[PDB]
Amino acid sequence: RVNSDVLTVKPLRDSVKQALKNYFAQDVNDLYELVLAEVEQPLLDMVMQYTRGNATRAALMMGINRGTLRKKLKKYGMN
Amino acid sequence: VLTVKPLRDSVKQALKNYFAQLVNDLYELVLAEVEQPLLDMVMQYTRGNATRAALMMGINRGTLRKKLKKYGMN
């Protein structure tokens, strides 16, 4: 049913659901971007700490190329 | 807007726990754990109406149905 259960905070998906439930409880036209930004930022931050700042190693671990990683970091002013 | 307090703090903690347990698919791995529940919640909110769900998410209907298919939710 679900891809993996290695991300736990108690799956991370449950935290996403609760956040959305509380979000809906309080019109929208950018919910995907809203969520994507909220998840990419901490992901990039944690991956860069794990690879001690090595951008190539972070891209490899993420499964994306260096240019894509640079673009994302840039987007969040993490460059 | 997304809190549990902000959602990003839960993402960060989950990644800390995961790394301590240790890869070349971390992005898709995380995206799958976040997209599936988002798709579940929005489809639930709109009672399974793809047009309304896509409009709320800011993506076209074609992209929504592709994601749903990707995760075998269709």
UniProtKB/Swiss-Prot annotation, chain B:
Signal peptide: none annotated. Residues 50-69 bind DNA. One of its GO terms (cellular component) is cytosol. SUPFAM superfamilies: Homeodomain-like. It is found in: Cytoplasm, Nucleoid. Coiled coil: none annotated. It comes from the Bacteria. Transmembrane segments: none annotated. Belongs to the transcriptional regulatory Fis family. Homodimer. This is DNA-binding protein Fis. It comes from Escherichia coli (strain K12).
